[PDB]
């Protein structure tokens, strides 16, 4: 755990700046459009499994030059709350 | 050379040609003899795609005839 996280945090922030995954390009890049309105033609670090992420995923971009640091699976919308049970 | 913003021209309004003892400005200022007090020449207000407007004394290489009041 200890030596793996050293180099995990190297390429991680501070800000992790959520993106929206518009389309993938297959060279380890994608075009994201951020909620903050500038696009980025992002790289992909290649430990998060390059093609395991698809349009509509929410992406963690680095505080400096944007690489896909990682990928969030699940982002709770109130629109799937209606379907999903609470009782 | 590049890069440089591209904007539209609000208007050409033009402050008087600088040969006057009393500023060079259509809208006259306080104080007696001016030329480069806060008197500047020919004026263009341009409106940007950075969502503001600016009053400048514009370059004299390019005429107030080469400036329309809606020119890019």
């Amino acid at each position: 755990q200890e030596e793996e996280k050293k180099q995990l945090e190297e390429i991680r922030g501070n800000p992790l700046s959520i993106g929206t995954l518009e389309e993938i390009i297959d060279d380890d890049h994608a075009i994201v459009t951020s909620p903050t309105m500038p696009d980025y033609y992002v790289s992909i670090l290649s430990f998060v499994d390059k093609e395991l992420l698809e349009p509509g995923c929410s992406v963690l971009l680095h505080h400096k030059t944007m690489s896909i640091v990682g990928v969030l699976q699940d982002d709770a919308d109130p629109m799937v709350s209606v379907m999903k049970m609470d009782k | 050379q590049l890069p440089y913003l591209v904007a539209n021209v609000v208007e050409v309004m033009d402050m008087n040609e600088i040969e006057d003892k009393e500023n060079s400005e259509s809208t006259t200022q306080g104080g007696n003899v001016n030329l480069d007090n806060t008197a500047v020449g020919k004026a263009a207000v341009v409106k940007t795609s950075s969502r503001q407007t600016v009053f400048l004394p514009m370059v004299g290489l390019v005429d107030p005839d080469k400036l329309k009041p809606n020119d890019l």
Binding site: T33, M37, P38, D39 | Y4, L5, V6, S49
Partner: peptide, 17 residues
């Protein structure tokens, strides 16, 4: 396309040469 520079519109809306 300006024949010999281009006018782009960024996704920032801001237009540039």
């Amino acid at each position: 396309i300006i024949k010999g520079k281009y006018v782009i519109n960024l996704k920032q809306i801001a237009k540039f040469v």
